[PDB]
Amino acid sequence: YNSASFSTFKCYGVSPTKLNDLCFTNVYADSFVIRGDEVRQIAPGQTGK
Amino acid sequence: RVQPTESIVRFPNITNLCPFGEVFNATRFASVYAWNRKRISNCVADYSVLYNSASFSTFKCYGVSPTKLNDLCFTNVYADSFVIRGDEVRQIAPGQTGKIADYNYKLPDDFTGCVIAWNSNNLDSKVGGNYNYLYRLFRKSNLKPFERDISTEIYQAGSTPCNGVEGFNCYFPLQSYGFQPTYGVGYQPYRVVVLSFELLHAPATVCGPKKSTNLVKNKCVNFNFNGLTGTGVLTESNKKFLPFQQFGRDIDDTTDAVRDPQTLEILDITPCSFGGVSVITPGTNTSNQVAVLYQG
Amino acid sequence: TRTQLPPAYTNSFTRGVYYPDKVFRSSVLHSTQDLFLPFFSNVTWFHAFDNPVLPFNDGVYFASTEKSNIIRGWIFQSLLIVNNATNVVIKVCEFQFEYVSQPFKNLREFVFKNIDGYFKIYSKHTPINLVRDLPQGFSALEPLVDLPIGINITRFQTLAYYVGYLQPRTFLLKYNENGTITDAVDCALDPLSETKCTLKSFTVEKGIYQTSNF
Amino acid sequence: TLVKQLSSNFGAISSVLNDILARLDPPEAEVQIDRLITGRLQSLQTYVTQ
Ligand SMILES: *[C@@H]1O[C@H](CO)[C@@H](O[C@@H]2O[C@H](CO)[C@@H](O)[C@H](O)[C@H]2NC(C)=O)[C@H](O)[C@H]1NC(C)=O
Ligand SMILES: *[C@@H]1O[C@H](CO)[C@@H](O)[C@H](O)[C@H]1NC(C)=O
Ligand SMILES: *[C@@H]1O[C@H](CO)[C@@H](O)[C@H](O)[C@H]1NC(C)=O
Ligand SMILES: *[C@@H]1O[C@H](CO)[C@@H](O)[C@H](O)[C@H]1NC(C)=O
Ligand SMILES: *[C@@H]1O[C@H](CO)[C@@H](O)[C@H](O)[C@H]1NC(C)=O
Numbered sequence: 001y002n003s004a005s006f007s008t009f010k011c012y013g014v015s016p017t018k019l020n021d022l023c024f025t026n027v028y029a030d031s032f033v034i035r036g037d038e039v040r041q042i043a044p045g046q047t048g049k
Numbered sequence: 050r051v052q053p054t055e056s057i058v059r060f061p062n063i064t065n066l067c068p069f070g071e072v073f074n075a076t077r078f079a080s081v082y083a084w085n086r087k088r089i090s091n092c093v094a095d096y097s098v099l100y101n102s103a104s105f106s107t108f109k110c111y112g113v114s115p116t117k118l119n120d121l122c123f124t125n126v127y128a129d130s131f132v133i134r135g136d137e138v139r140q141i142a143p144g145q146t147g148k149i150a151d152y153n154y155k156l157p158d159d160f161t162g163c164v165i166a167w168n169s170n171n172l173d174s175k176v177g178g179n180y181n182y183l184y185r186l187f188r189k190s191n192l193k194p195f196e197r198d199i200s201t202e203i204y205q206a207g208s209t210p211c212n213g214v215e216g217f218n219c220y221f222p223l224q225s226y227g228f229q230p231t232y233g234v235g236y237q238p239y240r241v242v243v244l245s246f247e248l249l250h251a252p253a254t255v256c257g258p259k260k261s262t263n264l265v266k267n268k269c270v271n272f273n274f275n276g277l278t279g280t281g282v283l284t285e286s287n288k289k290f291l292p293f294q295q296f297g298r299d300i301d302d303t304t305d306a307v308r309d310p311q312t313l314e315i316l317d318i319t320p321c322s323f324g325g326v327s328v329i330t331p332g333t334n335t336s337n338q339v340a341v342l343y344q345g
Numbered sequence: 346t347r348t349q350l351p352p353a354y355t356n357s358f359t360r361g362v363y364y365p366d367k368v369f370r371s372s373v374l375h376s377t378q379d380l381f382l383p384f385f386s387n388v389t390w391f392h393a394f395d396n397p398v399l400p401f402n403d404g405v406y407f408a409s410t411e412k413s414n415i416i417r418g419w420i421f422q423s424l425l426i427v428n429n430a431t432n433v434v435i436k437v438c439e440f441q442f443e444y445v446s447q448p449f450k451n452l453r454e455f456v457f458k459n460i461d462g463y464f465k466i467y468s469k470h471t472p473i474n475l476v477r478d479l480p481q482g483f484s485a486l487e488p489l490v491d492l493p494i495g496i497n498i499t500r501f502q503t504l505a506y507y508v509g510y511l512q513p514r515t516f517l518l519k520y521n522e523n524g525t526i527t528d529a530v531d532c533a534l535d536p537l538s539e540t541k542c543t544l545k546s547f548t549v550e551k552g553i554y555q556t557s558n559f
Numbered sequence: 560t561l562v563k564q565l566s567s568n569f570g571a572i573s574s575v576l577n578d579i580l581a582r583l584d585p586p587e588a589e590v591q592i593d594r595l596i597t598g599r600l601q602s603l604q605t606y607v608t609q
């Protein structure tokens with residue numbers, strides 16, 4: 001959170017300020033690389049190509 | 050017990066009417082970000098205007114039933130008006146959590162009054178969006194009841210400086226509602242008015258439409274004065290009060306002396322409910338004549 | 346001209362009470378708590394050229410001894426309290442809400458408090474020809490008017506007198522047959538004080554009394 | 560102590576029965592009245608035992 005070394009840093013549906021505080025069940029992650037014209041396509045309520 | 054016979058009213062002395070048209074029926078209303086407060090005194094309110102005429106969208110009275118509203122005199126009436134999204138209406142509730150209830154005007158848990166709301170179709174909406182109306186979104190800490198915030202500093206997130214140092218993790222705490230006629234019913238602007246008051250804390254200033262009656266003495270009857278009610282024999286007094294003193298108490302801190310707003314005199318209150326029955330008999334076998342006794 | 350001179354000091358001696366409510370009582374020992382002036386507290390005696398901006402705390406105690414009405418009003422948007430030969434002026438603005446009341450050797454006292462957006466004025470006129478240190482005589486400051494402005498006040502500036510500061514304390518006001526304050530005793534001053542407070546009487550006999558917990 | 564117990568609110572809106580009657584409704588007046596009944600009854604129990 002304090003790295004400040006990212007072009008995109010946002011938590012959807014949860015508070016990123018308070019994440020190290022509550023316990024979850026499972027954590028999963030998907031990683032890929034896209035163009036600069038496709039950054040906003042990957043977002044809730046966002047569609048496209 | 051002695052039974053009371055009649056009832057007397059020495060309740061009102063005012064004649065002016067409470068300014069209400071500008072309070073409700075008008076159109077110019079401040080944003081929920083900065084909510085106006087109005088002082089009302091020395092007049093009479095009418096539930097018939099509110100309860101009967103029109104229907105609006107909300108008549109939720111908390112603490113006191115609406116049907117009895119204009120029957121008890123109040124002190125220091127305060128009125129609050131603002132416009133929010135219809136989706137945000139539920140957040141205005143005693144003790145209910147909500148974003149507006151967290152970073153904007155928050156209703157106290159013990160609030161005693163009523164809230165009236167109604168939808169606005171296009172009165173406070175623009176085809177491109179009503180951006181004049183704003184709602185607080187970001188705040189370092191929560192608010193206390195009946196408080197306002199005026200600072201427009203850019204919200205600070207993380208260690209990145211904000212509040213003037215625009216940059217990463219810096220956002221404007223105020224967002225435009227953007228009300229539009231094409232918006233959904235839940236997203237349409239709603240005109241809500243919050244009214245609050247106090248009871249039995251001060252001399253009467255805003256009393257109900259009910260008029261007074263004559264003044265009887267030497268017979269325990271129902272009496273009402275500015276809201277206080279009781280039963281007992283009323284008579285003249287010898288104790289002299291200060292020019293400002295109104296009520297009268299005893300060792301038990303119970304009302305026993307009142308000032309009539311009309312006659313402006315010291316009135317005594319005495320208990321009228323009393324008695325207990327004791328029956329002495331010579332015995333069922335012996336005879337039947339009885340002799341009742343009253344204890345006190 | 347604005348001269349300088351070091352401040353003086355003096356002590357309060359059982360002075361300053363006011364009716365907590367508008368209600369009448371007679372020959373009782375009703376107990377109450379509010380923002381009062383604690384007994385035997387330092388009073389910053391200001392002797393007059395001097396007029397600093399005094400920090401307006403929660404509750405003050407303004408009292409002038411006797412003059413030729415050189416004092417006219419006070420300073421508190423901004424509240425404009427001032428008196429002329431004509432109607433006393435009550436205004437609220439940044440002068441460089443409005444109201445007037447009526448055209449206008451001793452000792453005068455005034456207390457200012459601000460609760461529930463209300464500005465209360467308790468005062469009392471006492472003809473006294475005593476000396477620099479004010480005498481010891483119990484009296485109350487009756488209410489005069491309550492003009493609500495409900496604003497944020499932090500500073501007040503005057504326009505030989507004393508000022509003090511109030512604190513939340515619990516008192517015990519003795520009432521006479523005519524319902525006038527005659528005696529007051531605290532229970533946050535000395536062990537005898539809290540003993541008198543918990544026994545709810547003005548006389549205590551030999552023995553042991555339980556007061557509170559540590 | 561009994562007499563002074565009357566002024567106690569006992570976790571209700573107010574203490575005066577007449578005042579509660581005026582500003583409330585019979586359909587839901589049961590809450591405050593019930594709480595007051597319980598409190599004052601318990602006070603009587605203690606006093607009678609003493
Ligand atoms: C309470 O008020 C009464 C009545 O004024 C006082 O009793 C005295 O009454 C006579 C009436 O003939 C007056 O001439 C006296 O001046 C009154 N005494 C005083 C001291 O004023 C009674 O004294 C008052 N109580 C107190 C504590 O002052
Ligand atoms: C108000 O009181 C005055 C004096 O007691 C009386 O003359 C007047 O008729 C009263 N008016 C109302 C509306 O009660
Ligand atoms: C103006 O307000 C009054 C009461 O506040 C109401 O009775 C009246 O209907 C309003 N006028 C309108 C809605 O045109
Ligand atoms: C009444 O009393 C008399 C004498 O005391 C006795 O003879 C008689 O049986 C009694 N009758 C009843 C109904 O108790
Ligand atoms: C009043 O202030 C002086 C110096 O500021 C101090 O010596 C004195 O102890 C104070 N009074 C009391 C009762 O403590």
Ligand SMILES: *[C@@H]1O[C@H](CO)[C@@H](O)[C@H](O)[C@H]1NC(C)=O
Pocket residue numbers: 429430431434
């Ligand atoms: C006293 O001062 C007030 C302040 O506005 C003013 O209105 C009034 O005319 C003055 N009167 C005299 C006699 O100077």
Ligand SMILES: *[C@@H]1O[C@H](CO)[C@@H](O)[C@H](O)[C@H]1NC(C)=O
Pocket residue numbers: 497498499
């Ligand atoms: C009152 O004003 C002071 C100084 O501007 C400020 O620090 C304080 O937060 C204000 N309080 C309120 C309640 O407005």
